[PDB]
Design a protein around this ligand. Structure first.
Ligand SMILES: Nc1ncnc2c1ncn2[C@@H]1O[C@H](COP(=O)(O)OP(=O)(O)OP(=O)(O)O)[C@@H](O)[C@H]1O
Ligand SMILES: [Mg+2]
Length: 158
């Protein structure tokens, strides 16, 4: 099967590389980045693909001048949580079980080119690294509430 890469991965570099790519596509977005140093054992290319796919969605559905939050904090001795947030329409509660399935398309989000594979890839990468993920509103009290993608990754503080 596909090569299984199991090497130390600096998540600060993974996120910084992913951000460089997407800042090009939407230079108006205010990316608010708060990343605690975190090392994951795995596949830097796969993790980079997963973070870029989430950042790409956050940018696509960001309003002009929108803020995208990119936050990674340790939550216990062996895990950290990456939360990527936008000020887009958000994904409503009833759809949150189609998110991460191939070919999902939200009726709340404006139709854009893309065939609905990015988040299925994210789920695969995160599971292959022993993580977990979920979707929620970024700020339920705000209009619009935005989407928050939450990714928990095992690893260690650097
Ligand atoms: N941050 C977000 N804000 C609003 N809607 C989102 C967001 N992220 C994902 N979605 C919705 O979930 C769908 C699935 O997302 P996903 O990234 O898997 O597919 P895509 O972006 O349409 O295509 P691809 O990622 O394959 O280019 C999107 O088409 C969109 O309806
Ligand atoms: Mg996508």
């Amino acid at each position: 099967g596909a090569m299984v890469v199991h090497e130390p991965v600096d998540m600060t570099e993974v996120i910084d590389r992913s951000l460089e790519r997407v800042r090009r596509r939407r230079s108006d977005i205010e990316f608010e980045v708060t990343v605690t140093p975190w090392q994951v054992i795995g596949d830097s290319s796969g993790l980079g693909r997963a973070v870029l796919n989430v950042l790409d969605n956050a940018a696509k559905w960001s309003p002009p001048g929108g803020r995208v939050g990119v936050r990674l904090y340790q939550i216990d001795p062996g895990h950290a949580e990456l939360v990527i947030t936008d000020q887009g329409p958000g994904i409503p509660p009833q759809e949150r079980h189609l998110v991460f399935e191939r070919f999902f398309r939200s009726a709340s989000a404006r139709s854009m080119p893309g065939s609905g594979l990015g988040l299925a890839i994210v789920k695969q990468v995160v599971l292959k690294h022993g993580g977990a993920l979920r979707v929620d509103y970024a700020d339920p009290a705000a209009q619009p509430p935005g989407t928050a993608i939450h990714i928990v990754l095992p690893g260690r503080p650097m």
